[PDB]
Design an enzyme around this catalytic site. Structure first.
Site, PDB file in Angstrom:
ATOM      1  N   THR A  16      -6.247   7.022   7.482  1.00 18.39           N
ATOM      2  CA  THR A  16      -6.757   7.262   6.140  1.00 18.39           C
ATOM      3  C   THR A  16      -6.785   5.977   5.314  1.00 18.39           C
ATOM      4  O   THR A  16      -7.151   5.991   4.141  1.00 18.39           O
ATOM      5  CB  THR A  16      -5.940   8.338   5.404  1.00 18.39           C
ATOM      6  OG1 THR A  16      -4.582   7.903   5.291  1.00 18.39           O
ATOM      7  CG2 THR A  16      -6.000   9.682   6.153  1.00 18.39           C
ATOM      8  N   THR A  17      -6.383   4.870   5.924  1.00 17.93           N
ATOM      9  CA  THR A  17      -6.601   3.551   5.334  1.00 17.93           C
ATOM     10  C   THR A  17      -7.466   2.712   6.273  1.00 17.93           C
ATOM     11  O   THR A  17      -7.556   3.000   7.469  1.00 17.93           O
ATOM     12  CB  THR A  17      -5.279   2.797   5.078  1.00 17.93           C
ATOM     13  OG1 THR A  17      -4.636   2.541   6.323  1.00 17.93           O
ATOM     14  CG2 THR A  17      -4.346   3.609   4.209  1.00 17.93           C
ATOM     15  N   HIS A  55       0.829  -1.209   0.000  1.00 17.53           N
ATOM     16  CA  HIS A  55       0.000   0.000   0.000  1.00 17.53           C
ATOM     17  C   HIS A  55       0.862   1.258   0.000  1.00 17.53           C
ATOM     18  O   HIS A  55       0.487   2.293  -0.553  1.00 17.53           O
ATOM     19  CB  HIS A  55      -0.920   0.025   1.219  1.00 17.53           C
ATOM     20  CG  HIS A  55      -1.883  -1.121   1.272  1.00 17.53           C
ATOM     21  ND1 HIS A  55      -1.889  -2.041   2.299  1.00 17.53           N
ATOM     22  CD2 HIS A  55      -2.867  -1.499   0.421  1.00 17.53           C
ATOM     23  CE1 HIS A  55      -2.838  -2.935   2.079  1.00 17.53           C
ATOM     24  NE2 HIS A  55      -3.448  -2.626   0.949  1.00 17.53           N
ATOM     25  N   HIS A  78       3.704  11.261   6.109  1.00 17.11           N
ATOM     26  CA  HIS A  78       3.066  11.078   7.415  1.00 17.11           C
ATOM     27  C   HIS A  78       4.018  10.455   8.420  1.00 17.11           C
ATOM     28  O   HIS A  78       4.520   9.338   8.226  1.00 17.11           O
ATOM     29  CB  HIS A  78       1.808  10.212   7.305  1.00 17.11           C
ATOM     30  CG  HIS A  78       0.663  10.881   6.609  1.00 17.11           C
ATOM     31  ND1 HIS A  78      -0.300  10.176   5.921  1.00 17.11           N
ATOM     32  CD2 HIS A  78       0.310  12.185   6.513  1.00 17.11           C
ATOM     33  CE1 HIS A  78      -1.190  11.014   5.419  1.00 17.11           C
ATOM     34  NE2 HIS A  78      -0.844  12.241   5.764  1.00 17.11           N
ATOM     35  N   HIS A  81       5.563   7.264   6.439  1.00 19.37           N
ATOM     36  CA  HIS A  81       5.297   6.788   5.095  1.00 19.37           C
ATOM     37  C   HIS A  81       4.778   7.931   4.239  1.00 19.37           C
ATOM     38  O   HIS A  81       4.507   9.025   4.744  1.00 19.37           O
ATOM     39  CB  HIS A  81       4.224   5.714   5.137  1.00 19.37           C
ATOM     40  CG  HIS A  81       2.945   6.190   5.738  1.00 19.37           C
ATOM     41  ND1 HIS A  81       2.691   6.127   7.089  1.00 19.37           N
ATOM     42  CD2 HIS A  81       1.855   6.759   5.178  1.00 19.37           C
ATOM     43  CE1 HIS A  81       1.495   6.625   7.337  1.00 19.37           C
ATOM     44  NE2 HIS A  81       0.964   7.008   6.192  1.00 19.37           N
ATOM     45  N   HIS A  84       2.161   9.278   0.760  1.00 20.37           N
ATOM     46  CA  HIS A  84       1.109   9.094  -0.225  1.00 20.37           C
ATOM     47  C   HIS A  84       1.442   9.989  -1.412  1.00 20.37           C
ATOM     48  O   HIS A  84       1.823  11.144  -1.227  1.00 20.37           O
ATOM     49  CB  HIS A  84      -0.243   9.507   0.346  1.00 20.37           C
ATOM     50  CG  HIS A  84      -0.625   8.768   1.587  1.00 20.37           C
ATOM     51  ND1 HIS A  84      -1.399   7.629   1.562  1.00 20.37           N
ATOM     52  CD2 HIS A  84      -0.342   9.004   2.889  1.00 20.37           C
ATOM     53  CE1 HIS A  84      -1.571   7.191   2.795  1.00 20.37           C
ATOM     54  NE2 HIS A  84      -0.943   8.008   3.617  1.00 20.37           N
ATOM     55  N   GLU A 130      -3.182  13.687   0.501  1.00 19.31           N
ATOM     56  CA  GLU A 130      -4.465  13.257   1.050  1.00 19.31           C
ATOM     57  C   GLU A 130      -5.258  14.471   1.535  1.00 19.31           C
ATOM     58  O   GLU A 130      -6.390  14.691   1.116  1.00 19.31           O
ATOM     59  CB  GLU A 130      -4.249  12.273   2.193  1.00 19.31           C
ATOM     60  CG  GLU A 130      -3.423  11.076   1.803  1.00 19.31           C
ATOM     61  CD  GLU A 130      -3.838   9.835   2.552  1.00 19.31           C
ATOM     62  OE1 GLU A 130      -3.598   9.766   3.780  1.00 19.31           O
ATOM     63  OE2 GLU A 130      -4.416   8.940   1.907  1.00 19.31           O
TER      64      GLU A 130
HETATM   65  C1  LIG Z   1       1.910  -0.309   9.631  1.00 17.48           C
HETATM   66  C2  LIG Z   1       1.023   0.205   8.526  1.00 17.48           C
HETATM   67  O1  LIG Z   1       0.337  -0.581   7.842  1.00 17.48           O
HETATM   68  O2  LIG Z   1       0.942   1.452   8.298  1.00 17.48           O
HETATM   69  C3  LIG Z   1       0.021   1.923   7.331  1.00 17.48           C
HETATM   70  C4  LIG Z   1       0.751   2.411   6.173  1.00 17.48           C
HETATM   71  O3  LIG Z   1       1.874   3.135   6.624  1.00 17.48           O
HETATM   72  C5  LIG Z   1      -0.030   3.321   5.257  1.00 17.48           C
HETATM   73  O4  LIG Z   1      -0.687   2.594   4.298  1.00 17.48           O
HETATM   74  O5  LIG Z   1      -0.959   4.219   5.906  1.00 17.48           O
HETATM   75  C6  LIG Z   1      -1.667   3.609   6.971  1.00 17.48           C
HETATM   76  C7  LIG Z   1      -2.630   4.748   7.237  1.00 17.48           C
HETATM   77  O6  LIG Z   1      -2.258   5.556   8.312  1.00 17.48           O
HETATM   78  S1  LIG Z   1      -2.103   7.025   8.119  1.00 17.48           S
HETATM   79  N1  LIG Z   1      -2.504   7.605   6.736  1.00 17.48           N
HETATM   80  O7  LIG Z   1      -3.329   7.303   8.881  1.00 17.48           O
HETATM   81  O8  LIG Z   1      -1.263   7.853   9.003  1.00 17.48           O
HETATM   82  C8  LIG Z   1      -0.773   2.936   7.982  1.00 17.48           C
HETATM   83  O9  LIG Z   1      -1.610   2.349   8.944  1.00 17.48           O
HETATM   84  C9  LIG Z   1      -1.469   2.476  10.237  1.00 17.48           C
HETATM   85  C10 LIG Z   1      -2.398   1.697  11.143  1.00 17.48           C
HETATM   86  O10 LIG Z   1      -0.392   2.952  10.727  1.00 17.48           O
HETATM   87 ZN   LIG Z   2      -0.668   8.122   5.675  1.00 15.24          ZN
END
Ligand SMILES: CC(=O)O[C@@H]1[C@H](O)[C@@H](O)O[C@H](COS(N)(=O)=O)[C@H]1OC(C)=O
Ligand SMILES: [Zn+2]
EC number: 4.2.1.1
Length: 257
Positions: free
Chosen positions: A195-196, A61, A116, A91, A93, A103
């Site tokens: 946001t996921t 993702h 983020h 991470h 987007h 986002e």
């Molecule tokens: C460990 C992991 O899967 O991280 C996710 C990943 O970094 C990313 O797709 O955004 C998510 C969305 O989070 S974000 N956009 O709210 O800050 C993250 O999800 C979470 C639970 O950290």
């Molecule tokens: Zn994010």
């Protein structure tokens, strides 16, 4: 399961994750002229001096730079936050084109990407418990625009070749996230969500006013990543952003005039 394609994208999430239509979903559009300066906000405190990065992972993702959060090594405090929030990962987007990818939007404007930095409230002991609390997480969001190169980002850019496909991961020690910050910590803040999926409404969003610039060559490399696992047909990792959601019964507060 969920993704960003035509058939599994954000418009579908509500079917598996009803909270998608919830009271405080993210991201949202930041209307700079409806946001309210809040003189009672304390200065934001980013303390990334003892930060310990461990690994970078493509999880299909996004890619996650993970940090050792077994101790208060890298924390976020102040601003609208109560207590100490510990850095767990950052991470991005981003889009298939420079005109889209962020986002959060600012007066409807889309940035090329959005960084983020995710922190969890240490009062709750672990990330898993913190996502179940309305003040469980603090995510520091930073806009990326295309222009001159961000030297602090380049270490991340160069390793992407080694985690091209889903599941891959590489060592990533001694990375200093302070190199990703703009000069100013002026921000907007509102209560929101991941946001996921699972889209849990556990996040205090802190979105910085000032973007960082990255080069077109840097963002292009983000776009060479894959959503797919190794040996599968190539789905380029692009447009992994959720569009803005309704603000509803919320207010966005500014740290500045
Ligand atoms: C460990 C992991 O899967 O991280 C996710 C990943 O970094 C990313 O797709 O955004 C998510 C969305 O989070 S974000 N956009 O709210 O800050 C993250 O999800 C979470 C639970 O950290
Ligand atoms: Zn994010």
């Amino acid at each position: 399961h969920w993704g960003y394609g035509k058939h599994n994208g954000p418009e579908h999430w509500h079917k598996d994750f009803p909270i998608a239509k919830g009271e405080r979903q993210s991201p949202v559009d930041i209307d700079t002229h409806t946001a309210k300066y809040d003189p009672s906000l304390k200065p934001l405190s980013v303390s990334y001096d003892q930060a310990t990065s461990l690994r970078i992972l493509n999880n299909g993702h996004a890619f996650n730079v993970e940090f050792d959060d077994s101790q208060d090594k890298a924390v976020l405090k102040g601003g609208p936050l109560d207590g100490t929030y510990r850095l767990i990962q950052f991470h991005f987007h981003w889009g298939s084109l420079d005109g889209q990818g962020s986002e959060h939007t600012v007066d409807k404007k889309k940035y090329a990407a959005e960084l983020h930095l995710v922190h969890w409230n240490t009062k709750y002991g672990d990330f898993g418990k913190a996502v179940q609390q309305p003040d469980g997480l603090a995510v520091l969001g930073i806009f990326l625009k295309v222009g001159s190169a961000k030297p602090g980002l380049q270490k991340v850019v160069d390793v992407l070749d080694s985690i091209k496909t889903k599941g891959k991961s590489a060592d990533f020690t001694n990375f200093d996230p302070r190199g990703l910050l703009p000069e100013s910590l002026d921000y907007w803040t509102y209560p929101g969500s991941l946001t996921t999926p699972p889209l849990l409404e556990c996040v205090t969003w802190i979105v910085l006013k000032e973007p960082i610039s990255v080069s077109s060559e840097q963002v292009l490399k983000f776009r060479k990543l894959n959503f797919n696992g190794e040996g599968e047909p190539e789905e380029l990792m692009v447009d992994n952003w959720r569009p803005a959601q309704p603000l509803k019964n919320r207010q966005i507060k500014a740290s500045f005039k």
